[PDB]
Amino acid sequence: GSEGHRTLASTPALWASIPCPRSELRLDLVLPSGQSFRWREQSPAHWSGVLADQVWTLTQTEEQLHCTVYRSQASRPTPDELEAVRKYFQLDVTLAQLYHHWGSVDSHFQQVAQKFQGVRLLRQDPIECLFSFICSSNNNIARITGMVERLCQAFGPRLIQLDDVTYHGFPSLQALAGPEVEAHLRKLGLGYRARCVSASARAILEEQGGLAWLQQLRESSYEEAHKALCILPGVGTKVADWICLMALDKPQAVPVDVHMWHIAQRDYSWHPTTSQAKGPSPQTNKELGNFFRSLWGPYAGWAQAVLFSADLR
DNA sequence: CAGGTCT
DNA sequence: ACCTGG
Ligand SMILES: *CCOCCOCCS*
Ligand SMILES: [Mg+2]
Ligand SMILES: [Mg+2]
Ligand SMILES: [Mg+2]
Ligand SMILES: [Mg+2]
């Protein structure tokens, strides 16, 4: 009872609810969908992971988001701790309002979105997000999850153990910048991406001003933050857009990939007009992202998340 | 060859 | 131009 991953039924005294409709947040569409790679459904409908340097288990009913924290004497999450969950899910951003806007300007969105409510963006840490998305180059969601887990196990601080899972926090820049990290990361199957992690951890810390430079790209404009991220090894345009959208408070960023081409073409009959080339290219990908920004508005990347979730079936 | 990044 | 999965 007192050992292991908790469930709402098994230890009801250690949970606290946050008012949050299922239409504002679907955990099963947000937490496993390749935004974060570090949440696990360890019991049915119960998602466990590291959030604000502690381990949480989250589950929901129709009107409540139920939360528990593993810290020495076990107790409910305090008020300040629940705000970190609200902050992580960005719950002040009302989806009801966004879905209404997107629907009003896009009848295709109106048609598809009703089935896929509660899709929102997590407000991720920029370090974690950066190095996760560096591991996603030439890769799929299954292997990426594994690489990130091993990376965190090897180089991240031990938090606590629940059942047979030892939770680790995401590694610091210092740990990823350290001697022989590439070789160690290669032993963990990351391949050529091992170099990129090491090099980008070193470039941030030793060439760019460290953690502070990255964190202050939150305050900088989208265009600035994107340009700044591209100088890092393993970070091209797509990767930078993902980081901008997921970790640097740029809701207008629209990461363009072949998947977005398929949507644009099949669902909006989109073709590049200004650009010369017909297919994907840096010129045409920039044009596509702009199309959806003008269509959807300042939260275009959140809209994309909904269509991405809907296409996934 | 597909679909990203580096210079 | 360069890289690695399917
Ligand atoms: C698509 C070319 O990949 C860029 C990675 O370069 C090797 C350093 S990790
Ligand atoms: Mg991430
Ligand atoms: Mg290193
Ligand atoms: Mg780069
Ligand atoms: Mg908008």
The structure was resolved to a resolution in Å of: 2.4
> What is the DSSP secondary structure assignment for residue A248, as one 8-state letter?
S
Residues 6+ apart with CB under 8 A from A179: none
> What is the DSSP secondary structure assignment for residue A251, as one 8-state letter?
T
Query: Could you count the other beta carbons within 10 Å of the beta carbon of residue A275?
Result: 15
Which residue lies with its CA nearest to atom 2 of ligand 1?
Answer: A234
Which residue lies with its CA nearest to atom 5 of ligand 1?
Answer: A234
Q: Which two tokens stand for residue A124?
A: 């991720």
Cβ-in-10-Å burial (0-12, 13-18, 19+) of A178 comes to: middle
Q: Which two tokens stand for residue A161?
A: 């153990």
Report yes or no: A267 and A311 within 8 Å, Cβ to Cβ: no
For the CA of A199, the nearest atom of ligand 1: 9
Q: Is the CB of A191 under 7 A from strand C?
A: yes
Give me the residues paired with residue A160 across strands: A167
Specify the long-range contacts of residues A156-165, CB closer than 8 Å, at least 24 apart.
A159/A50, A159/A53, A159/A54, A159/A55, A160/A55, A160/A70, A162/A4, A162/A5, A162/A48, A162/A55, A162/A70, A163/A3, A163/A4, A163/A5, A163/A42, A165/A5, A165/A40, A165/A42, A165/A48
Give me the residues paired with residue A165 across strands: A162
Distance CA A175, CA A131 (A): 12
Phi, psi (rounded to 5 degrees) for A63: -110, -15
- String of b and e for A63-83 (b: at least 16 CB within 10 Å)? ebbbbbbbeeeeeebeeebbe
Which residue lies with its CA nearest to atom 4 of ligand 1?
Answer: A234
**Nearest nt (C1') from A238 Cα:** B4
User: Which structural technique was applied?
Assistant: X-ray
Query: Could you count the other beta carbons within 10 Å of the beta carbon of residue A8?
Result: 20
Q: Which of A272, A249, A302 is nearest to A113 (CA)?
A: A302
Inter-axis angle of helices A282-296 and A95-105, to 10 degrees?
110
Distance CA A260, CA A85 (A): 30
Report yes or no: A46 and A59 within 8 Å, Cβ to Cβ: yes
Q: For residue A206, which ligand has an atom nearest its CA?
A: 3
**How many Å from the CA of A25 to C1' of C5?**
34
Which of helix, strand or coil describes residue A192?
coil
Q: Is the CB of A264 under 7 A from strand B?
A: no
Query: Could you count the other beta carbons within 10 Å of the beta carbon of residue A92?
Result: 7
Which is catalytic among the residues A115, A187, A227, A238? A238
Backbone region of residue A93 per phi and psi (left: phi > 0; alpha: psi in -120 to 50; beta: other values): beta
H or E element at residue A268: helix A258-268
Report yes or no: A169 and A156 within 8 Å, Cβ to Cβ: yes
Q: Do the strands A158-162 and A64-70 form a parallel or antiparallel pair, or are they unpaired?
A: unpaired
Q: Which two tokens stand for residue A227?
A: 């340009």
- String of b and e for A140-172 (b: at least 16 CB within 10 Å)? eeeebbebbbbbbeebbeebeebeeeebbbbbb
Distance CA A113, CA A102 (A): 9
Distance CA A5, CA A296 (A): 40
